[PDB]
Write a protein that binds this ligand. Structure first.
Ligand SMILES: O=C1c2c(O)ccc(O)c2C(=O)c2c(NCCNCCO)ccc(NCCNCCO)c21
Ligand SMILES: O=C1c2c(O)ccc(O)c2C(=O)c2c(NCCNCCO)ccc(NCCNCCO)c21
Ligand SMILES: [Mg+2]
Ligand SMILES: [Mg+2]
Ligand SMILES: [Mg+2]
Ligand SMILES: [Mg+2]
Ligand SMILES: [Mg+2]
Ligand SMILES: [Mg+2]
Lengths: 663, 666
DNA sequence: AGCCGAGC
DNA sequence: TGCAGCTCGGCT
DNA sequence: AGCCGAGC
DNA sequence: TGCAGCTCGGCT
C-alpha cells in the first residue's frame, strides 16, 4: 500500500496469499509486457513490480546500506517478509502476502546477474524459503516459459556463496579459470527445474565472464570492447568537424552493434577525450567543450548533449589506416563491426593506463611516458634491452619514486616560503583540487571533533589546469610540521601499488603481468610481426596496382596508335580481343580475391579524356611512379616501416603538446 | 538569517546580515549559467553575490490558483532566499530591513526564451511587490571567457527602470489572462510594421515592447502551423532531414533527432524534437490520419493518449511510403530553401498534393492566438480536389478520424457532436464499444466508470475486453437503474458524447501572414490556388530541365556516332585543341549546367563518358535514351498542370489503399 | 570508507 | 533506466 | 480545473 | 534541463 509502480495482486494479503505470485521485472518495460500478458484475468493471483538497475549485494553489505536500500525494502514490504524470521514450518508462511516470487529479466547476461542478486538476497536472509521453492523465473505456452528454482542440497548453498561473497574472490578466480580453459578446449573442437548450483555454474558464470570481457582491456591496443567500438566508429566516420558526444554515441551503437544503454557509451567517449592531469597521457579524442577538470576529477563534465568531440590528429598516427587491412574484424548478425583488436605502433595500454573491475579479477595500470616508450621500442629494434620505466603522468610536476616492486611514492609539491607560509603547487596524481581542499585544508583550518587546527589561513590561486595553495601557519606549528615531514603532514604523498596488471593477451587469454617490461615485450614481438604482414601486404597490393596501371597505360597507347580499336565492337568481341592480346583481368581485384570471367572494367571505365595528350602523359607518369613506389617499399624492412611511423608520431606529438602549452 | 534546505543556492557571504541590501542574488537560466557565474565571481565575488539556478519556465503568478502558487518550488525558493513576504509594502527604508538581498540580477540566454523567463520573473515581482520595482530591485546581466565577463561586469549590467503607469500596463499586457485581445492587437501591429520594413537603464515598457514581443512572435512562428503544408518549423525540419537522409531502414528516434539538429540547424533542446518525431509517427485512433513517419516500436496507444510511448532511445522510425507521394521530390526544385548561417536548411514550406493541414488536424498554442483543426478524410479531400479541377464545387466536409467507429454530426458551422458507441445487450447489461475521439480508455475508466461503480453508485460491475487499438466495456446494472439511464439517454449518462468546436483556425498563409480562416472550405480553396499554380511552375521547370537533358543527350549521342565513324578523333589531341574543335563543330557547352545557371565552354559531360560508350551495346543504349528523353519532354509539353496533379493524386490513392489494407491485416 | 568505470 | 512542471489560448 | 504540444 | 544507486576487486 502506497508504493509507486506496484500493481499489487487482488488476492494478495488474504486467504489465498500463498497462491499469489509477485513478478519482479527488469525495468518498467518488462513490467508493462507482464501487465499486458497478465490481466484482466491474471490480476488476482499475480502482482507486478519493476526493479531499475542492479540491486544491492546484501550478503556482506553494511547495516546502513541494507536499511536504506529502496529496492530491498519495497520487496520486503510487498511480500510481507521479516528479517530473522525462519520459515521452517507451514504455519509461519501465513504472514506472507505472496507465496511465490517470479523473477523476469532480459534473456541476457546482465539479466542473469539480477536473477542472481535476487536469489542471493533471499538465500541470505531466508534460506528456509528456498527449500519450499519460493523462487521461479520467466524465460522469454505461458507455462512452458515458467521455470522453477529448486534447492537440492548444500552444494547449492556453496554455489550461491561462491558467486556473491566477498570472501570467495580466490574461488571465483579458479571458477572462471576452469570455465575459460574449458571453453578454449571446446573452441578447438565443438561447442522445468533448475538447481541453484546449475544456475550459478551454467548461467551466472556467463555474466561473470562477459563482465571480464567488457571491463578488462586487451594488452594489444589497451582497449575494452566498448572503447574499441568508439574508435572503430570514429575511424569510419572520418569526421572533419566536431560531433555532439550524444550523437557520436548513437552512431557507435548503429555502426558497431553496441547492445547496451547509451549513457554508458557517452561516459566512455568522455573518458577517452579527457586530458587533465591524471587522466590520459594521450587522448585519442578531442575534448571540445567542458569534459571535466582536475578540480573535480572530471565529475564536472557537462552533459554529453552539449559537448563535442573528434579524433585527435595523433589517433591515425598511432593506429595507421594501412594496418586495418591486417585486423580481424568481428561480426554481429552478418554486420561487420570492430576488430578483435587494433595494433597501435606503441603499447597504448601503458600510455593511458588501464582501469577495470570484473569478476575474479581487476586491472590497474598507471600512465607511462609516450617518449620513453618510443625510445625503448627503438632500443628493442636495435637488439638492445629496454630500460626500466617508472610511471609518468603528462604535466604532473611532482615525483614518482620506486619503493619496492610495483609500488611507488607519488608526491606533490610543497615549499616553505617564510616562517609563516607554505605554498602547495602540485597535488599527487588523482588527488583532485576540490577534494584536497575540502578533506585536507578545511579540517586543517577548522579542526574537527577528532583533530586540532594546524593552519591559520589558506588562499587559492588555481587555474583550470594547475594548483596553487598559499597556507599561513604560526611559526610554532610550521616548525612542528617540518619536523614531522611537510609532505606527510599535508597529505601530499600517496602510494601506488600495481600488483593487479591483468590483461587479455593477443590470443584472448586472461593473464597476470608481473612487470610492465613483460607487457612491453609481448606487445613488441606482436607488433614487429605485424609490420612484417604490413610489408607483405603492401608489396602485393602495390604490385597489383603497378600491373593495373601497366595494362591501362598499354591500352591507351595501343589505342592512340591505332593498334587497337573498340569503336562499335560488341562487348564479347571486345573481351575476347583483349584476352587474345594478353591484357590481364583486373589485377587489384584478382589480388584481393586471392587474399580469401575476365574483368576489363578498370580499362574500359576510363573516361574519353584518357585518350588526350595531357592525360596520356599523366597516365605514363603515374605508371612509372607506382613502379618506383613498389621498389621503394621493397627496400624497406619491417623495422624501417616501424621507425618511419614512430618518427611521424613524435613529430606530431611535439607539435600537439607544444600547442597545448600555448592554447 | 541563513538558508537551510536549498541545495543549489550559493548564498552571498553577507546576505542576511548588516550588508544585506548591498547584496545581489543572481538568478540564472539553468545550472550551466550558474557555474559560469560562480566562476566569474571567483573568490572576491562570493561576498556580495549569491547565485541560484532556475530550471525551466516558471509559474505565471498573476491569476494563478492559490494552490499552484503555494506548492511551486521556484517562487517559494526565491521568496525564502530573499526573505520576501506576501502582502508587505516595501515603500520606505524601514520595510527594506527584512530582506537578505537588496537586488536580483537576472541572467538568461540572450535569446527569445531567455527574454520570456526575464519577463516572468519581472511579472512575479510586479504582481506581489510593485513597491520593490520603484526602488530598482531588478537588474539583468547580458567557457573560460566567464572570468573575463565579470571583471567587465558593469558594461554587461542593465538596470530595469520603473517610469510610470505605462510600465504597469506593459507588464499587464504581456502576462494577464484578461488581456488576450490586447495581445492580438499588440502582435498584429508588430507584424505589420515588420512587414513594411522589408519594403544602461531599461524601462519595463521598453522591455515588453521591444524585447519580450520578439519572444511572443517567435512563439507563434514555432507553434502555429502553415496552411500550405500543415507543418510548424520543427516538424518541417524533421521531414526535410528525413528526405535528405532517405533512410531505407529504421533509425532510432533519438539518433534521428540529433541528425535533424545537425542538418537543419535546430537550435533547441533535443527532447522537444524527439517528442515531435514521436508525435508525427503516431497512428492510434485520434492521432494522425496519415502518419508521415512509421511507428516502429511502442509510440503510445489510445489507452493513455500516447503518453505510454517508450523512450526515444528504444524506438525506431523511418519515412512512410506515402510521404514522398504526398510531397513529391520534383517539387523540391520550386521551394524557397532557408539559410541558417551559410548552411542551407528546410524550406519556408513544402507544397503537398493535398492540404495536409486538414488531414492530420494541425494544432498549437502561441501568444495572442492558438490553432485547432480536426482531422479530415484523405479520400474525401482528394475527391474535392478532383471536383475543383473539373470546375465543380467542392462538397462540404465533416471531420473524420481514421478507424473511429463512432459518429461525428454537424450541429452548425465549425460545431460538432462526437459520439462513442453504447448498446443495450440485455436488461442488465450495456456494452460500450467506442469512445468519442480523444477520450482515452484509461481516463474514461478512471473518471467515468469508476465513479459510477462508487461515489450515488449507478452501475453494479464492469469488465474490460480492450485491445491495444479497440475499446470494449461490458457494464452490469439493475433493470431499474438501466431503465432510468436509457430514459435519460445512454450516451448522455455514460458521457459518450463530447462537442468539438473549431472557431480558432489560425494559420500562417503562403506569404507568412497570420490569418484566421472561418471554414475549412476557405482553407481548401486558398491551398488549391497555390498548389495549382505550383503544378504550373513544375511543368515550366520540368520542360526546361528535360529539354536541357534532351540537348545534353543529343550532343553525347552525336559525339559517339561521329567517333565510331571516323568523323572525329580525340586520340593524342591537346586539351586546348580539343575544346576549340568541339566548339567549331558546334557541340554545346553542358546544356544542363547552362540551364541551371540561367535561373569557357564545358564539354566534360561528353569527355567524362567511359570508353564503354564506343561499344556496340552502349551506342544503341545511348540512342534509345536520347529518343526516350525526347519523347518525355514532348509528352510533358502536351499535358496540363491539372493532368499532372491528377497523376499524383491517383498514385497517392493507390498506395494509400495498399498501406491501409496492410495495416488492417497486420 | 570510498575511488576507479562499464554495465543495469 | 525513469523521475520532476511550467507557458501560452480555446475550450470544456 | 485540465487537455493539447513546442519550448525551457 | 538535471535528479536518483548499485556491482565487481584492489587498494588507500
Ligand atoms: O537504475 C539506473 C539505471 C539503469 O537501470 C539503467 C541505465 C542507467 O543509466 C541507470 C542509471 O543511470 C541510474 C542512475 N544514475 C545516476 C547517476 N550515476 C551514474 C550513472 O551512469 C541512478 C539510479 C539508478 N537506479 C536506482 C536504483 N538503485 C539500485 C540499488 O538497489 C539508475
Ligand atoms: O526544467 C525542465 C526542463 C528544461 O529546463 C529543459 C528541457 C526539458 O526537457 C525540461 C523538462 O523536461 C522538465 C521536466 N520534464 C518532465 C517531463 N514532462 C514534460 C515533457 O518534457 C520537468 C520539470 C522541469 N523543470 C522543473 C520544474 N520547473 C517548472 C517551474 O515551475 C523540466
Ligand atoms: Mg539487457
Ligand atoms: Mg584512463
Ligand atoms: Mg536558449
Ligand atoms: Mg496530430
Ligand atoms: Mg488556463
Ligand atoms: Mg565493495
Amino acid at each position: 500500500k502506497g508504493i509507486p509502480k506496484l500493481d499489487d495482486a487482488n488476492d494478495a494479503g488474504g486467504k489465498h496469499s500463498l497462491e499469489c505470485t509477485l513478478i519482479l521485472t527488469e525495468g518498467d518495460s518488462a513490467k508493462s509486457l507482464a501487465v499486458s500478458g497478465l490481466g484482466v484475468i491474471g490480476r488476482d493471483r499475480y502482482g507486478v513490480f519493476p526493479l531499475r538497475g542492479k540491486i544491492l549485494n546484501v550478503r556482506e553489505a553494511s547495516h546502513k546500506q541494507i536499511m536504506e536500500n529502496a529496492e530491498i525494502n519495497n520487496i520486503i514490504k510487498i511480500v510481507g517478509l521479516q528479517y530473522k524470521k525462519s520459515y521452517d514450518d507451514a504455519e509461519s508462511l501465513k504472514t506472507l502476502r505472496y507465496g511465490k516470487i517470479m523473477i523476469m529479466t532480459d534473456q541476457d547476461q546482465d539479466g542473469s546477474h539480477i536473477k542472481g542478486l535476487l536469489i542471493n538476497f533471499i538465500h541470505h536472509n531466508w534460506p528456509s524459503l528456498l527449500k519450499h521453492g519460493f523462487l521461479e523465473e520467466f524465460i522469454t505456452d505461458m507455462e512452458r516459459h515458467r521455470i522453477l528454482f529448486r534447492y537440492a542440497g548444500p552444494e547449492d548453498d556453496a554455489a550461491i556463496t561462491l558467486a556473491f561473497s566477498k570472501k570467495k574472490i580466490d574461488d571465483r578466480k579458479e571458477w572462471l579459470t576452469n570455465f575459460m580453459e574449458d571453453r578454449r578446449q571446446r573452441r578447438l573442437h565443438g561447442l522445468k527445474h533448475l538447481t541453484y548450483n546449475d544456475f550459478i555454474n551454467k548461467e551466472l558464470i556467463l555474466f561473470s565472464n562477459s563482465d571480464n570481457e567488457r571491463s578488462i582491456p586487451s594488452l594489444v591496443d589497451g582497449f575494452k570492447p566498448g572503447q574499441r567500438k568508439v574508435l572503430f566508429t570514429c575511424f569510419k566516420r572520418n569526421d572533419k568537424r566536431e560531433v555532439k558526444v550524444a550523437q557520436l554515441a548513437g552512431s557507435v551503437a548503429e555502426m558497431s552493434a553496441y547492445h547496451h544503454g547509451e549513457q554508458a557509451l557517452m561516459m566512455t567517449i568522455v573518458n577517452l577525450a579527457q586530458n587533465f592531469v591524471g587522466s590520459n597521457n594521450i587522448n585519442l579524442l578531442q575534448p571540445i567543450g567542458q569534459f571535466g577538470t582536475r578540480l573535480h576529477g572530471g565529475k564536472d563534465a557537462a552533459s554529453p548533449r552539449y559537448i563535442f568531440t573528434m579524433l585527435s590528429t595523433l589517433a591515425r598516427l598511432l593506429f595507421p589506416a594501412v594496418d586495418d587491412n591486417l585486423l580481424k574484424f568481428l561480426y554481429d548478425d552478418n554486420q561487420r563491426v570492430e576488430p578483435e583488436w587494433y595494433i597501435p605502433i606503441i603499447p597504448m595500454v601503458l600510455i593511458n593506463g588501464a582501469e577495470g573491475i570484473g569478476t575474479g579479477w581487476a586491472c590497474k595500470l598507471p600512465n607511462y611516458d609516450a617518449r620513453e616508450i618510443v625510445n625503448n621500442v627503438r632500443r628493442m629494434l636495435d637488439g638492445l634491452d629496454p630500460h626500466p620505466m617508472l610511471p609518468n603522468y603528462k604535466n604532473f610536476k611532482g615525483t614518482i619514486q620506486e619503493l619496492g616492486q610495483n609500488q611507488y611514492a607519488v608526491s606533490g609539491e610543497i615549499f616553505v616560503v617564510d616562517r609563516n607560509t607554505v605554498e602547495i603547487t602540485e597535488l599527487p596524481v588523482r588527488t583532485w583540487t576540490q577534494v584536497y581542499k575540502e578533506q585536507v585544508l578545511e579540517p586543517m583550518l577548522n579542526g574537527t571533533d577528532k583533530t586540532p587546527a594546524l593552519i591559520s589561513d589558506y588562499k587559492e590561486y588555481h587555474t583550470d589546469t594547475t594548483v596553487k595553495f598559499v597556507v599561513k601557519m604560526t611559526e610554532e606549528k610550521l616548525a612542528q610540521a617540518e619536523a614531522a615531514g611537510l609532505h606527510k603532514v599535508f597529505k601530499l604523498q600517496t602510494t601506488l601499488t600495481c600488483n593487479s596488471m591483468v590483461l587479455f593477451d593477443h590470443m584472448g587469454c586472461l593473464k597476470k603481468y608481473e612487470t610492465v617490461q613483460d607487457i612491453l615485450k609481448e606487445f613488441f614481438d606482436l607488433r614487429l610481426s605485424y609490420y612484417g604482414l604490413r610489408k607483405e601486404w603492401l608489396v602485393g597490393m602495390l604490385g597489383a596496382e603497378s600491373t593495373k596501371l601497366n595494362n591501362q597505360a598499354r591500352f591507351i597507347l595501343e589505342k592512340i596508335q591505332g593498334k587497337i580499336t573498340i569503336e562499335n565492337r560488341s562487348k564479347k568481341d571486345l573481351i575476347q580481343m583483349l584476352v587474345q592480346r594478353g591484357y590481364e583481368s583486373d589485377p587489384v581485384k584478382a589480388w584481393k580475391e586471392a587474399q580469401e570471367g575476365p574483368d576489363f572494367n578498370y580499362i574500359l571505365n576510363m573516361s574519353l579524356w584518357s585518350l588526350t595528350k595531357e592525360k596520356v602523359e599523366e597516365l605514363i607518369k603515374q605508371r612509372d611512379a607506382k613502379g618506383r613506389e613498389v621498389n621503394d617499399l621493397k627496400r624497406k624492412s619491417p623495422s624501417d616501416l616501424w621507425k618511419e611511423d614512430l618518427a611521424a608520431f613524435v613529430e606530431e606529438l611535439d607539435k600537439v603538446e607544444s600547442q597545448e602549452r600555448e592554447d
